[PDB]
Design a protein around this ligand. Structure first.
Ligand SMILES: CCCc1c(SC2CCCCC2)c2cc(Cl)ccc2[nH]c1=O
Lengths: 517, 401
């Protein structure tokens, strides 16, 4: 058998001393049968009046279910499961892959003797004046806090040997599922499997027979898994006339899921339907552009596209495109334009930004993603020129760094629609703004702004200035705020005001922005 | 015999997450840990250990060898205090830094504390559980180790100490700062003497390239004002702004005269001749700035803060202060990419904080976390790790340095 993992209750707490609900004699009868067998098997053992602990049991043919919530509340935290699932692109191709169901694994693993007492429950006796049988577990209780972790752990130790003995094979654990991949000949692969089931069996570990095992493809948490390729479970778009906020929200959901493999999915127009929505049941009619998008997507979906697996041998190449203002599309591949995975990036970090910054952020997402999936960073191919990047780079207060990248002339090319002058302009008029401005040349304009906020008035002034000024302007302001914003050379913003200004800026020949107290 | 250590009252163990590592680093970490396992330094752990500290693989200076770096930052914070700094050291001409971390590997760790030293070698794309371990011996990077090894340490050092009293020796975490004023040639040789004298007892590389810090030469970068031929309206305005700012530190700074030059909505480029009054006012402002503000004393009981500003072209600016505007020190740093430079900086700055006060500062970094988290380990070389947080450098503070 396997080495016991020592368990303890949470500090300062005591075992579950919870009362057993009343049980129907028909249910009492069913339990006893179940418990006897379990005892006959060693899973539990009758105990005495010594143990004051108890955990509820109820009947759900008949089945046995024990309520471990309370014990679990009193049981220590474990390093747990993993809640970190591999992403199909992270995998490598395999000739064969079989999966076995570690039938009732927990019940196959012992339990820290010292902990056993806390698992004590009670099967009430049928007649009044008589006592009810008391038990406790000897193995991992179904539904108990530990079980999962402890079960996996032991599994791994059990698998550890065979693993190093059979290098030409790989195994993945997930709950009670054991996946075995190999690049062996079906026959050899299929026997190695049997070679494995025995090793498990050698530890009373039982698994389904080939006659009833599961072979590819696999529908795993939104996926369809073939030995040589992967994709996402098929996605069917509705064809309703009436679309509800809820239906739309879901559609947008499913649509995103696709994103990772289906390139060019677009959800802008649909997402727009959610504006102002007052109820989850509210119906929203589709826009002309929403219908267009839905239909465009419907088509992209009609095409069964698939992902390729990681070939550790080849490098990773990442390619990024601007799909829309704020939208970026990318695809990681190893072999020429034959993706392992793809995806989008709409992440606007901050009220205002520019494609350079936003593109650079896309790079960091991908970089993180890659490291998480393939353990390495991909060589990037971006629609920006080094000179452009380097320029914005060295001139931005925040430190940044982009891996290895190659300029790829694939329109549109991200750029800087304007650059503030490092030195004030001679011959260019000078505006002193504050809601209004005054120029060295005598001109002045004041305007009554309604509803505005302190800061929003500072940009208005400036806007006003730019407007009236000729191609070359000098602008002095006291708002550090607006200065930061414009010094940051944004080319897009959630605020319209800011966009208008940005427009002005692009058009100018030269603009010098200065600050003063 | 193991000295019973405890976490500050009430405090539980760390359960810090592990940042995604690159396959290569994971490999290094596996090779290392497997040998440390063979040598009984560590031991695999089960699921009954819910705690975790982040590990990393960094690169040794002048070696193909990797170094395992454990971020026991959180643990050290939940670790009980233990019950000093040679102000002279900062004065020596040459301070060399040695890594005496392996010292600890020959000292068992209180069995009960071990569970808290838990760490994990993650696995790629979560295809495997991850490799979990905990220490049996004193772990490098844990604030505890120096302490417990303190005794056994002083012994080892008492002979050399008396033999070469012209030498100052300071230990910090896994580092040992050796200082003197001997001719560089001598310094280096006497150092090597210590190395072998350390070997004489048991398992020491040269940190920082085996090269020397020259603390004697460290100097405060004062605020400076643009000295130019002709002064235009813009120049002045900038000047005034900057002064105005600096005023909050040195309240002796007057602008009255300079601002008078700025009366009337003139043109930025218009050249303004300075009146003698202002000329003298500036001159005074200049002299006032010639040195740090008096009254800035270091408080051993306050956190040491360190902010860095990106100046561009491989140039950076920093300041060590405990109280706002009350800089205990300020400096510059020139080259690489933004990140490399930046890390190199932090490390320089830290090393000094230690050398000078014996405490690592807490930095404020002008960078996006995800980024830092990604590349810092690529250039990092120290054995310690400062506390850090990420910020947004204001446009003007940069212009003022
Ligand atoms: C067991 C090794 C992991 C692995 C798998 S199992 C895959 C593990 C996660 C759960 C679903 C199945 C895999 C499966 C298919 Cl269908 C094709 C290629 C593959 N390549 C691989 O490296």
């Amino acid at each position: 058998p396997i080495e016991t993992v020592p368990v303890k209750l949470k500090p300062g707490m005591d075992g579950p001393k919870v009362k057993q609900w009343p049980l129907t004699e028909e249910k009492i009868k069913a339990l006893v049968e179940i418990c006897t067998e379990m005892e006959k098997e060693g899973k539990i053992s009758k105990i005495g009046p010594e143990n004051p602990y108890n955990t509820p049991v109820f009947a759900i043919k008949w089945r046995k279910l024990v309520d471990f919530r309370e014990l679990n509340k009193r049981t220590q935290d474990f390093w747990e499961v993993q809640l970190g699932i591999p992403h199909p692109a992270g995998l490598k191709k395999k000739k064969s892959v079989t999966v076995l169901d570690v039938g009732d694994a927990y019940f196959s693993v012992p339990l820290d003797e010292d902990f056993r007492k806390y698992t004590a429950f009670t099967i009430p006796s049928i007649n009044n004046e008589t006592p009810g049988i008391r038990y406790q577990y000897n193995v991992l209780p179904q539904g108990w806090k530990g079980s999962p972790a402890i079960f996996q752990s032991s599994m791994t130790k059990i698998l550890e040997p065979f693993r190093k003995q059979n290098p030409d094979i790989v195994i993945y654990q997930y709950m009670d599922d054991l996946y075995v991949g190999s690049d062996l000949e079906i026959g050899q692969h299929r026997t190695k499997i049997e070679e494995l089931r025995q090793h498990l069996l050698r530890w009373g570990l039982t698994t389904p027979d080939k006659k009833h095992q599961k072979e590819p493809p696999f529908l795993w948490m939104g996926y369809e898994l073939h030995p040589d390729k992967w994709t996402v479970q098929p996605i069917v778009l509705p064809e309703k006339d009436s679309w509800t906020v809820n239906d739309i929200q879901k559609l947008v959901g499913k649509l995103n899921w696709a994103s990772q493999i289906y390139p060019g999915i677009k959800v802008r127009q649909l997402c727009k339907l959610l504006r102002g929505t007052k109820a989850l049941t509210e119906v929203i009619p589709l826009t002309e552009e929403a219908e267009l998008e839905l239909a465009e997507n419907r088509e992209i979906l009609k095409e069964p596209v698939h992902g390729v697996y990681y070939d550790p041998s080849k490098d990773l190449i990442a390619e990024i495109q601007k799909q829309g203002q704020g939208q970026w599309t990318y695809q990681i591949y190893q072999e020429p334009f034959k993706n392992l995975k793809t995806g989008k990036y709409a992440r606007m970090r901050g009220a205002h930004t520019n494609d350079v910054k936003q593109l650079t952020e896309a790079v960091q997402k991908i970089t993180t993603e890659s490291i998480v999936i393939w353990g390495k960073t991909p060589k990037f191919k971006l629609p920006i020129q080094k000179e452009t990047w380097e320029t914005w780079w060295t001139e931005y207060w925040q430190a940044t760094w982009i891996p290895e990248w190659e300029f790829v002339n694939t329109p549109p090319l991200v750029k800087l629609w304007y650059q503030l002058e490092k030195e004030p302009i001679v011959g260019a008029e000078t505006f002193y703004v504050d809601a209004g401005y005054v120029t060295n040349r005598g001109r002045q304009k004041v305007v009554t702004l309604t509803d505005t906020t302190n800061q929003k008035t500072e940009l208005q002034a400036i806007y006003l200035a730019l407007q009236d000024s000729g191609l070359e302007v000098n602008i002095v302001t006291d708002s550090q705020y607006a200065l930061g914003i414009i010094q940051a050379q944004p080319d897009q913003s959630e605020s319209e005001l800011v966009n208008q200004i940005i427009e002005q800026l692009i058009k100018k020949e030269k603009v010098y922005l200065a600050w003063v107290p | 015999e193991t000295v019973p250590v405890k976490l500050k009252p009430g405090m539980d163990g760390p359960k810090v997450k592990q940042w995604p590592l690159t396959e290569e680093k994971i490999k290094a970490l596996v090779e290392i840990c497997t040998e440390m396992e063979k040598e009984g330094k560590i031991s695999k752990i089960g699921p009954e250990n819910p705690y975790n500290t982040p590990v990393f693989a960094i690169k040794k200076k002048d070696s193909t060898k990797w170094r395992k770096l454990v971020d026991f930052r959180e643990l050290n914070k939940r670790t009980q205090d233990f019950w000093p700094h040679p102000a002279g050291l900062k004065k020596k001409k040459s301070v060399t830094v040695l890594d005496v971390g392996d010292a600890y590997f020959s000292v068992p760790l209180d069995e009960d504390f071990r569970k808290y030293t838990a760490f994990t070698i993650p696995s790629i794309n979560n295809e495997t559980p991850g490799i979990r371990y905990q220490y049996n011996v004193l772990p490098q990077g844990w604030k505890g180790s120096p302490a417990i090894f303190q005794s056994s340490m002083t012994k080892i050092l008492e002979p050399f100490r008396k033999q070469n009293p012209d030498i100052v020796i300071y230990q910090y975490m896994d580092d040992l700062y050796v200082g003197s004023d001997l001719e560089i040639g001598q310094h280096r040789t006497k150092i090597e003497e210590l190395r072998q004298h350390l070997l004489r007892w048991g398992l020491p590389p040269f940190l920082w390239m085996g090269y020397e810090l020259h603390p004697d030469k460290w100097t405060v970068q004062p605020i400076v004002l643009p000295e130019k031929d002709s002064w235009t309206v813009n120049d002045i305005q900038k000047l005034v702004g900057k002064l105005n700012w600096a005023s909050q530190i040195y309240p002796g700074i007057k602008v009255r005269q300079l601002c008078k030059l700025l009366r009337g909505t003139k043109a930025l480029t218009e050249v303004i001749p300075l009146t003698e009054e202002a000329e003298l006012e500036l001159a005074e402002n200049r002299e006032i700035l010639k040195e740090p503000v008096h009254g800035v004393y270091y408080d051993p009981s306050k956190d040491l803060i360190a902010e860095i500003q990106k100046q561009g072209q491989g140039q950076w600016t920093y300041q060590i202060y405990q109280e706002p505007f009350k800089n205990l020190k300020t400096g510059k740093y020139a080259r690489t990419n933004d990140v490399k430079q930046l890390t190199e900086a932090v490390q320089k700055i830290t090393t000094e904080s230690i050398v000078i006060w014996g405490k690592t500062p807490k930095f404020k970094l002008p960078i996006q976390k995800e980024t830092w988290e990604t590349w810092w380990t690529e250039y990092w070389q120290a054995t310690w790790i400062p506390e850090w947080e990420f910020v947004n450098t204001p446009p003007l503070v940069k212009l003022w340095y």
